[PDB]
Each structure stands twice: as structure tokens, then as C-alpha cells.
């Protein structure tokens with residue numbers, strides 16, 4: 001057993017708060033905000049050795065990232081940003097920092113009861129996205 005055991009599995013989005021304002025802060029345009037904001041993604045998290053994989057599947061876009069903790073990688077986000085990402089574990093929370101165009105956003109993922117809670121922060125704006133097991 002290991003580092004991210006409690007994150008592994010298949011998860012479905014059940015609630016979202018303040019996501020449009022977060023996307024606006026990130027710089028997402030109108031049409032993408034509308035379509036992306038409708039989506040109810042499934043997130044599939046797996047671990048193989050040191051490599052963590054997070055897949056998301058939705059009506060809007062499918063994305064996939066594989067990474068080693070602390071080791072920067074290139075990511076294409078669902079809104080088509082080309083970012084440089086670093087993901088670490090801080091006290092049981094996955095902390096994902098994305099850098100692009102001189103900007104930065106942080107996504108934190110934690111287990112809370114039977115949920116996986118995703119908090120997305122850009123400057124002073126937070127969005128909270130809650131997932132349940134699928």
C-alpha cells in the first residue's frame with residue numbers, strides 16, 4: 001500500500017461551485033466556459049510504481065496526465081492551455097501547480113469522507129468541485 005491509495009479509482013463529478021468565475025480568472029473565453037461548465041467529468045486515478053495517472057473523460061474533452069511527484073511535465077488542459085505542471089503530496093493533499101504565459105493556478109485534491117474534493121485557485125478566486133465514487 002502506498003502514497004495515493006485513497007485517491008485511486010473512478011470518480012464522477014457531483015457538484016461544482018464558482019467554476020465560471022474561476023475559468024474567467026484563468027482567461028477562458030465565453031464559448032469554452034459555457035460548454036466546459038456543463039460537463040460532468042469522470043476522473044480515473046491509478047498508480048503504477050512511481051507513476052500516477054489522472055484521466056478525465058467528458059462530453060467536452062478527454063484529458064490524461066501521467067507524472068512522478070515533484071517532477072515537472074508538460075500538460076494540455078481541457079481549455080487547451082499549454083502549461084508546465086508540477087504535482088506534489090503535501091500532508092496527504094495532491095498539490096498541482098500549472099504555469100503558463102507568466103500566470104499560475106493551483107489545484108488541490110483531497111479525500112474528505114467518501115468524496116474527492118478538488119479546489120481550484122487563481123489569484124483570489126476559488127472553485128470547489130466535488131467527486132463521488134462512480
Ligand SMILES: O=C(O)[C@@H]1CC[C@H](Oc2ccccc2)C[C@@H]1COc1cccc(Cl)c1
Pocket residue numbers: 023026028036039040041043056057058060061062063077078079107118120129
Ligand atoms: O477535476 C476538475 O474538475 C478540474 C477542473 C479544472 C481543471 O480543468 C479546467 C477545465 C476547464 C477550464 C479550466 C480548467 C482540471 C480538472 C478538470 O479537468 C477536466 C478535463 C476534461 C474535461 C473537463 Cl470538463 C475537465
